[PDB]
Amino acid sequence: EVKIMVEKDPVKTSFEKWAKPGHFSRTLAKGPNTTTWIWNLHADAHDFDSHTNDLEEISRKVFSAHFGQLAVIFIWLSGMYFHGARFSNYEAWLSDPTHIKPSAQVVWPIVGQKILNGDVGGGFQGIQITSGFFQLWRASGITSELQLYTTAIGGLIFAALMLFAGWFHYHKAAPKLAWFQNVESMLNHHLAGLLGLGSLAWAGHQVHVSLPINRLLDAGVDPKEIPLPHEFILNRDLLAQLYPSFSKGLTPFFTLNWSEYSDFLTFRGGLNPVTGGLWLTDTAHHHLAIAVLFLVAGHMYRTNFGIGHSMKEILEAHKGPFTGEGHKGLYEILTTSWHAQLAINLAMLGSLTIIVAHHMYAMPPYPYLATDYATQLSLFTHHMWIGGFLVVGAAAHAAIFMVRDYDPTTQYNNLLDRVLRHRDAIISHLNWVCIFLGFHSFGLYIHNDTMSALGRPQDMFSDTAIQLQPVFAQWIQNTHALAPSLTAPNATASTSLTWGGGDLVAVGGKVALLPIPLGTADFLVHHIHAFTIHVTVLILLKGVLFARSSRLIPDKANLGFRFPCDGPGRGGTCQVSAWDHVFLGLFWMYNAISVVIFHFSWKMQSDVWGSISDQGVVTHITGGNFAQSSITINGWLRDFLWAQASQVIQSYGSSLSAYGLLFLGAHFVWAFSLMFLFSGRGYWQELIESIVWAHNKLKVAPAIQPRALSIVQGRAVGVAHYLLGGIATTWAFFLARIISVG
């Protein structure tokens, strides 16, 4: 049944298809009559399922493209490591991580840009990075530039390797469709092999090299006197000097008496009191448990060895009264369509990125991470944006599947059919709840603004006037604050310091974390978050459901997934496809994520961070003005935008000048997007004729006739420039603020 399947040498490697630019699609392989050929070439350059029709070639192309992407990622990683090795103040940072700003990039002195190499400390001059790579290397046990150089080379090797594979499995030994379809063995190997063995190997590295080196770094010894990471491998006695449990050998693990490993396999909440990060003796135990979890979970599905589940008997068995014929006919969907898999994978990966961004700020896993505010803010914002993009991509690919892979002749299996058969109800109720949330979230802010404007603050929705204390979040905080005493007797402390329990921790001045309060100003913004998320789901789900047909256009699936409009008739049918719904949902995703990152920035600078002095007095950065000034839009205008934007604007003539330049650059790009977002193709196509006339008058008429951008490319360009401008503006503002004041 399950076996290796390969077709020897299916495509001769050559340069013939390389000289003919358009070769994948026959419609544009002929040549560029007009200039709307250069555009759609790059447009459908990666539309593998559009060039051909057989799943086999599509799957082979997908495989090789994955290999190329992995090679590019490996080149990126090797470059980051080589820069940390050659142009970084890492060794100087290790001797004083609380007074040396990280930096791993230097600039050539050519045109006066030399001043971008600011004084970061340690006798170095370069741009201050915020990737958090220094903390990651300190937590990994890396303690010398040499140990970076090597791994850089290592990465490069893998890069080449990946490229080789990418060529091989398309040109010498490419599989056939029947091989990719074995999803049972694929999941078996990704659970047991990739995640399980990977976690086990990292737990091994931790428990062997990362624990003793980091412990000796916490004891205050010089990073040069620390023995090399192999002196703890060929000397169990030198390692047992810190964790004497190693003196007991590998015997406790095999006699099930491994409760004596409590030295390096701990269960302790809170953060390390000197590094402001998690206990590596805890993360080692965590990885050791996760590894065996994924390993025993990688034996569920059936292969050619008789035992195991089959993910078709599992599906059909779930078929209730309310839901027609259950999950029947879904195993046929997710093994004969690459899009219905990409949708689920993108949705789950985006949600997981959001979970990661929420967890890492609250439980700092790297030493001296919660101290460096710039890194902790960038790692939140970047990951939030990535997740917000991935979820919209999931929506788009679900729409694509519904448009050109769905068919009813087999989808009489009343689960997808049933949800398709009450879309007019799903979207109606989602619309109503969106309206309700929008009103009961934004009208409260408008109320507060009008009251504070009418000289009557006593009628506001503040924490002094009518209160809206979120009781459920407070109860959850109080419940997790008491867990290490009742509902977690073995855990020494709560999982995080953000819960109301616990106390403050300092890393030499600046504060790392403390219990976070929750008042009305948090109630309002959480409801605003819910409202924006709901509107985004509304747009995307409406597009996905009405991707096939609607009352307006009953044969929309014949038109396709991507098309501008079905005429100016029926009153007007502009922006009626699913691609246009993704276009419209990108802006609301941008809105939502921008509000989230503003929330996080202000709340952290106001109620979390700061610099404590002796006797315990702690003064936050802004001064705790979030609970009172964030209830009115004017407060977000002056106390957040106007006030905090005072660092970037006056950064000229300093090491933070590039942020001040990119502020205005991103403003220009954002405003430039409006030219494409507001205008239309006809005006520009007409205007181009009056320029072609002047060209013909002087015999400079090009042979590739200059047509204007299509109605869909205009929208694509507009949304791309809009997102670039907005995100780059927020990037520059956030960095120029937090680098100087954090």
Binding site: K3, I4, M5, K8, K172, A173, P175, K176, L234
Partner: protein, 213 residues
């Protein structure tokens, strides 16, 4: 003759055709790349040859130095001699790295000719090899070159005894592969050569077997 069913390719032809393949790595349906049924027997053959050549040399110094024949240069562990510097190394007439590049230069000639005889059977008997152009033609299977040099004595004349010799060779090669794997592993949980492990097991197995560390 058991532990698997002779599905469609382990009929009984090859020397050592015990019909054992629970995964199906010789299945001729998907065969491209390196797991075709013509590369796997060859790979097993010469991996077993190298294991037979290594599982003897791993113990030879340690067992010879106990007879007092060799001077006290024979590293009682097979690994304290150059092959791994950090756990001990012996000083020879040259750097281990120049020894390594000399070994690679001498082995490139020894291996590229064999590769060309596998990929191109009749070749390596046409191009004038320097000095005495020797008759090293591909006399039959790329795993049994025959010849007046690779068969000094001509041991094995007709099909019966030659097939017996072949199956003996593949069985000894599998045994030697398992032996060198055991060397590699038990050099970690003990910290001493394999012959010393055997001696300490002969001392008393109740307190010196694997279940003591």
């Amino acid at each position: 003759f058991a532990s698997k069913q002779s599905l469609s390719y382990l009929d009984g032809t090859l020397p050592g055709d015990y019909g054992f393949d629970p995964l199906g790595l010789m299945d001729p349906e998907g065969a491209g790349g390196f797991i075709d049924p013509q590369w796997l027997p060859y790979a097993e053959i010469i991996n077993g040859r190298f294991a037979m050549l290594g599982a003897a040399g791993a113990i030879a110094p340690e067992v010879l130095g106990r007879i007092g024949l060799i001077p006290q240069e024979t590293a009682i562990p097979w690994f304290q001699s150059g092959v791994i510097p950090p756990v001990g190394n012996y000083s020879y007439w040259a750097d281990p790295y120049t020894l390594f590049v000399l070994e690679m230069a001498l082995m490139g000639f020894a291996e590229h000719r064999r590769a060309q005889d596998y990929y191109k059977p009749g070749s390596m008997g046409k191009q004038y090899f320097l000095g005495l152009e020797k008759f090293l033609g591909g006399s039959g299977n790329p795993a049994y070159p025959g010849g007046p040099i690779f068969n000094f004595l001509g041991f094995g004349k007709n099909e019966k005894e030659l097939q017996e010799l072949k199956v003996k060779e593949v069985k000894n090669g599998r045994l030697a592969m398992m032996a060198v794997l055991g060397y590699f592993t038990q050099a970690i949980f003990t910290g001493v050569g394999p012959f010393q492990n055997l001696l300490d097991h002969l001392a008393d197995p109740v307190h010196n077997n694997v279940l003591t560390n």
